Amino acid sequence: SASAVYVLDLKGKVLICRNYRGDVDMSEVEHFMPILMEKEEEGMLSPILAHGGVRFMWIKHNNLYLVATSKKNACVSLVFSFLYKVVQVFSEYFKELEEESIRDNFVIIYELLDELMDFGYPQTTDSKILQEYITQEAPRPPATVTNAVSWRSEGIKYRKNEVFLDVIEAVNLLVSANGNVLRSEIVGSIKMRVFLSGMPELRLGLNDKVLFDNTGRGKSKSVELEDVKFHQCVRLSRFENDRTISFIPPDGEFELMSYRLNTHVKPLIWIESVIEKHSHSRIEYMVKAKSQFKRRSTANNVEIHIPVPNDADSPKFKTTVGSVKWVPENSEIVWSVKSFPGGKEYLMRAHFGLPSVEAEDKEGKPPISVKFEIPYFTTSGIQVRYLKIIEKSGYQALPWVRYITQNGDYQLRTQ
Amino acid sequence: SKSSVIGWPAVRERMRRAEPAEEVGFPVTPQVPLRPMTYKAAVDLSHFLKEKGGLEGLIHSQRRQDILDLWIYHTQGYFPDWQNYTPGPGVRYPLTFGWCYKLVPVEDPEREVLEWRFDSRLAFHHVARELHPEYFK
């Protein structure tokens, strides 16, 4: 129930605003900046602001705060969803998220904002549909929005029907300083870049534990994702009835399904860190990394970030494999490795001095995280069975998909 | 299939060595297609196993079945799930339609000795599907 949504700047100047209900005066945006400054200075800053009886919910964007003033107790979740959709639409239309594009495409920006929502109720949410009706460089509204099938525009013609899938794996490991991993969750991501002719209805099929149990084939390696979320085009009725993933694929790259379940397997990388820091004399970095993944898998672009001292200077690195660079902006040493074969064991020995003057205040102990990304590895063991590509005209599709394993929340608590 | 013929003797020797009763991760070969075995493919595999021997009359074992499924997946990319047996007790019909191999008793269902037997009518009659229509969807 936001009264009006506006785009602000880092200096407090509003890049663009669009009133939807008119129940709140436009001058309330000025008081938002002092309120935000006070909240940040007092630790009471929150995304949902409140200026008296009018709430100005703001979201920190790439360059400006997306302030959405509201008057009544409207759907806060709905307002957040509308703001996220607007951000996604702006990112799709404008490749840059800064003040340069805010003041460069205002003519089309105003039309897009007007078409997006009216009277506080969002109406248009398809980026492709918005581009087919609002362009920066007008015809009647497309019938796809009026029709039920708003996730697959009809009439698409392509020379070849190629779909690029991406099996993105996110391994998040929360290892405490005591050596025990508390939060070990793996989140799947089934994103497909479908580029074909027409609006084929995808018939997803994979080696799911629930599907195998229902079909009686619950004896092989079946992925039992704790949380699986279907895309907009995915038909939830088939999934609820018999796990039938039947939906119209979108024109382009989209995330159809995203698995999310806990992980009970050993970590892909076992990192042992040693802090031989003298009392204002020297610092020791006994970093040992062990690759617990299969030797047949190589972690490309491995970056294990080891936080160095805030006031540390004159550091010397004694490692075996992988370049180590101390970033003054990062104030930490990142164990950069180009390719990390599975089972590799890297030992590092840091040595640097410390200032004679003691620090006035403590800086905390940020966790140590790695940036490993080993593709072509399916740790979960979930294997896609088939993709039912059905077209009324009839064509032979050649879909493609790649499994990518990366390091997500693989943060290890510091000692 | 020269590769399949070459792998048949080693696979049969490994299955015979295993009695009837270390590396982590899930590496995937690059560019190798993965899909379940088809009915025609299952029939062809059953016929090849019957012709080469070592499949009909062999004592059914979990380790032997797993080894055979892994060898089939390595040789042709077929998922090792179509070589399923019908629920017991008694003769376990092929799980995938078109398969010419089935497990039958040779003497609790787990303690019953099972032997793989060729079945031409299995590739044409959905005995497993008829027995368990719910499992077939």
Partner: peptide, 18 residues
């Protein structure tokens, strides 16, 4: 080639499930 796992051909459905 491409980092993060090469694209592989996908089937249409489970042929062993009828």
């Amino acid at each position: 080639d491409r980092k993060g796992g090469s694209y592989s051909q996908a089937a249409g459905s489970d042929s062993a499930q009828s």
